[PDB]
Write a protein that binds this ligand. Structure first.
Ligand SMILES: Nc1nc2c(c(=O)[nH]1)N[C@H]1C(S)=C(S)[C@@H](COP(=O)(O)OP(=O)(O)OC[C@H]3O[C@@H](n4cnc5c(=O)[nH]c(N)nc54)[C@H](O)[C@@H]3O)O[C@H]1N2
Ligand SMILES: Nc1nc2c(c(=O)[nH]1)N[C@H]1C(S)=C(S)[C@@H](COP(=O)(O)OP(=O)(O)OC[C@H]3O[C@@H](n4cnc5c(=O)[nH]c(N)nc54)[C@H](O)[C@@H]3O)O[C@H]1N2
Ligand code: SF4
Ligand SMILES: [Mo]
Length: 720
């Protein structure tokens, strides 16, 4: 069938598999893994069933306007839509200042789209109200990397998986969430049976079936668990003083300078016999995990939402880094502290791109007066155009919309009416009778469209070209494989036309296409520790991704950051083999963060922990994977997981309709009684739009990253 294969990237998870899209007579007919990208030709079942999604007729294909709140969506021309969008936004700024408008985007947006949007808002409008769904996700890992190393993003790559001799896998259901990486992990243990795997997660998932040890600790007690591991490492003389004496600093519980002796004193509060009882685990798991971690030749940690979606998320990230820093299990092949990124482009588009409320592109910060001046110079802005104040972070943004402080919002390639925490609160904010909400959305069944005043039809996935930056610092091009249907337009172009019409200086949006923007972005990264100047559109066309830092066309890219001879940001003649250059003295920092718990812990009235999780067949809100019949055959609808020994004790059996109730709402769900959830925990998925589980969850956030605690709240269950 296919006459040609078009190279791109899988639409789904931050594993970032390359994809070849097979096309015949302008239509996509087949898909295979890119043999030259890291996945080496392999896709999971989601990746492999992308053609039905791309070919679906169930698409937003024309602009729609709701003339009045509560009205119905009706057809409207592109020009009328762009004029309406431009005049409302312009008028808002004219009347109330830039802070009355906001961008709410996505880690699924092309890097180029998020770049243009971020520039329009911060540089054109003069507001820093640019945030996005990675606030819900990766913000705690950013905080953890910036506080430990002074720079965002992993220092290792997926390649370290192939030399790791121990895996510490915490708050990650890698099997269901990163299937191609899970297979690479399983394969490593297959090829070297000596490889040790620790899986640390209150639920027993498919990820545990390759583990030497499954640590089913009590929700929120993992900080005490990880401090206790460090206590064992030091107590049994398994630390690395040649490393930490030269390359580490110590900060105490107050965030003040300290030392190794201070660290040991602090760790006395986390002895294994005490912590085992806090965590509800056998004491031998603490010793066993610590010893596996520190005795192994090369140890790699991997983690995702169970660690990040936490009011102690930044701190929990810090503790993982602590373990690597005290042992020097870092900056060597196989040995690294690796945050897993959930979305295909949270890394490239939002974090690296600085498309969050407090950031500027390529490692710059809003509160830094010098970073503002650098961006005004790079972007051709008048002096002081960039507001000194961070804009609203996602949770505060929707609160601001609720108050009427934010009057005009663009929502793009994300579905916040389904996925924000505390939905009953959120749905009210999104119903402000004087709000103007514009949605750029590919599928009509996204529940957010029920709040939209204006809906614009986007080009989907490989209907246009653009870069995705996955979890390992790999930036990969998707070339255009097919035309968009109907009146669908590339969002890069829509954003440019919107800005022009809203009175933005045309010098600020001088872009015909995504390649034009990519070239300006390259220049804005030049000289920074992100420098990807060497990633020309032409190299990205021929390559299956390049890994930053990559400062010139003759540069291969970078696998080991902070390492002399590997990282071009480390001077060739630096006195030391390693250089944590994001800190002013080149040293990484161990943080003695106190272990606490969730914002909403169980009590007499709500005695269970409630968590939320993923499932392999379904992608987030299922507006895409929902179009694939094969993906509906195992878990067609939501359920609640309940512990066996909990349920029997409370007269609940498998299949029973149960009421799950928090302080915020109550929902009926079929009971899925087993040993997956440890005792005292229940668990709901969020893929089902008929069961908006975020109505049950609380909005409490990490006070630094502002990531919501989706992983923990308090609940009760009773038979319906
Ligand atoms: N199939 C599929 N894959 C995906 C996605 C999808 O929608 N579908 N989405 C992608 C995105 S954007 C992301 S963020 C990743 C998410 O990937 P994961 O975070 O790996 O998946 P979750 O099920 O949300 O992960 C939560 C795991 O953390 C656990 N957890 C709960 N409480 C705690 C705690 O107190 N401590 C610890 N340490 N763990 C806890 C839960 O038991 C759960 O099994 O998946 C990505 N991959
Ligand atoms: N309870 C609970 N809630 C959670 C989580 C959890 O673990 N538990 N996880 C959180 C995390 S980590 C994340 S990443 C978020 C993700 O949450 P969302 O981002 O809200 O979920 P998605 O379904 O990925 O949203 C992508 C949207 O883009 C649309 N779309 C697809 N292609 C295109 C395109 O080209 N253009 C446009 N405009 N739209 C397109 C899809 O139809 C869909 O509505 O959810 C968060 N919510
Ligand atoms: S592991 Fe992730 S990126 Fe790879 S094919 Fe599966 S969904 Fe796509
Ligand atoms: Mo995510």
């Amino acid at each position: 069938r296919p006459e040609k294969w078009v190279k791109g990237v899988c639409r789904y998870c931050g594993t970032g598999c390359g994809v070849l899209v097979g096309v015949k007579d302008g239509k996509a007919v087949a898909i295979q893994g890119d043999p030259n990208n890291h996945n080496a030709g392999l896709l999971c079942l989601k990746g492999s069933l992308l053609i039905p999604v791309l070919n679906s007729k169930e698409r937003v294909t024309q602009p729609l306007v709701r003339r009045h709140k509560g009205g119905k969506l009706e057809p409207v021309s592109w020009d009328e839509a762009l004029d309406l969008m431009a005049s409302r936004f312009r008028s808002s700024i004219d009347m109330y200042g830039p802070n009355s408008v906001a961008w709410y985007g996505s880690g699924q947006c092309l890097t180029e789209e998020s770049y243009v949007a971020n520039k329009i808002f911060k540089g054109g409008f003069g507001t820093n109200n640019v945030d996005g769904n990675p606030r819900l996700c990766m913000a705690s890992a950013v905080g953890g990397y910036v506080t430990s190393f002074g720079k965002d993003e992993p220092m290792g790559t997926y390649a370290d998986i192939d030399q790791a001799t121990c895996f510490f896998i915490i708050g990650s259901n890698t099997s269901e969430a990163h299937p191609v990486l899970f297979r690479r992990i399983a394969r490593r243990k297959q090829v070297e049976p000596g490889v040790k795997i620790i899986v640390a997660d209150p639920r027993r998932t498919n990820t545990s079936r390759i583990a030497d040890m499954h640590v089913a600790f009590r929700p929120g007690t993992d900080l005490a668990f990880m401090h206790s591991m460090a206590w064992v490492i030091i107590n049994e003389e398994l630390d690395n003083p040649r490393f930490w004496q030269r390359y580490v600093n110590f900060m105490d519980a107050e965030g003040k300078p300290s030392d190794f002796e201070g660290y040991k004193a602090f760790l006395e509060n986390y002895r294994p016999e005490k912590v085992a009882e806090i965590c509800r685990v056998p004491v031998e798991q603490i010793y066993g995990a610590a010893r596996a971690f520190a005795e192994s030749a090369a140890t790699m940690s991997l983690w995702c939402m169970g660690i990040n979606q936490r009011v102690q998320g930044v701190f929990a990230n810090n503790l993982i880094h602590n373990l690597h820093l005290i042992t020097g299990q870092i900056c060597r092949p196989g040995a690294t502290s690796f945050s897993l990124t959930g979305q295909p482009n949270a890394c490239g588009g939002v974090r690296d791109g600085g498309a969050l409320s407090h950031l500027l592109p390529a490692g710059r910060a809003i509160p830094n007066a010098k970073h503002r001046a650098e961006m005004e110079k790079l972007w051709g802005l008048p002096e002081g155009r960039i507001a000194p104040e961070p804009g609203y972070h996602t949770v505060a943004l929707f609160e601001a919309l609720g108050r009427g402080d934010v009057k005009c919002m663009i929502i793009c390639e994300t579905n916040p009416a389904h996925t924000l925490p505390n939905l009953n609160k959120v749905h009210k904010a999104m119903s402000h009778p004087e709000s103007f909400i514009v949605c750029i959305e590919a599928f009509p069944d996204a529940v957010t469209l029920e709040y939209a005043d204006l809906v614009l039809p986007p080009a989907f996935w490989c209907e246009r070209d653009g870069v995705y930056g996955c979890g390992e610092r790999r930036y990969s091009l998707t070339e255009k494989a097919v035309d968009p249907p109907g009146q669908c337009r590339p969002t890069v172009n829509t954003l440019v036309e919107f800005a022009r019409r809203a009175g933005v200086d045309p010098q600020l949006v001088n872009f015909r296409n995504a390649e034009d923007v990519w070239n300006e972005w390259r220049m804005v990264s030049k000289g920074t520790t992100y420098d990807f100047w060497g990633m020309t559109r032409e190299r990205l066309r021929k390559e299956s991704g390049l890994i930053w830092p990559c400062p010139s066309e003759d540069h291969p890219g970078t696998s080991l950051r902070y390492v002399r001879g590997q990282d071009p940001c480390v001077p060739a003649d630096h006195p030391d083999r390693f250089f944590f250059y994001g800190k002013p003295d080149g040293r990484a920092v161990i943080w003695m963060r106190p272990a606490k718990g969730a914002a909403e812990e169980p009590d007499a009235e709500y005695p269970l922990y409630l968590t939320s999780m993923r499932v392999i067949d379904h992608w987030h809100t299922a507006t895409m994977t929902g179009k694939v019949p094969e993906l509906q055959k195992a878990n067609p609808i939501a359920f609640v997981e309940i512990n066996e020994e909990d349920a029997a004790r409370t007269g609940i059996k498998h299949g029973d309709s149960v009421i799950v109730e928090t302080r915020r709402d109550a929902m009926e769900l079929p009971a899925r009684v087993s040993d997956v959830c440890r005792p005292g925990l229940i668990a709901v998925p969020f893929f089902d739009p008929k069961k908006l589980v975020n109505k049950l969850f609380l909005d409490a956030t990490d006070p630094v990253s502002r990531e919501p605690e989706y992983k923990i709240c308090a609940a009760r269950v009773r038979k319906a």
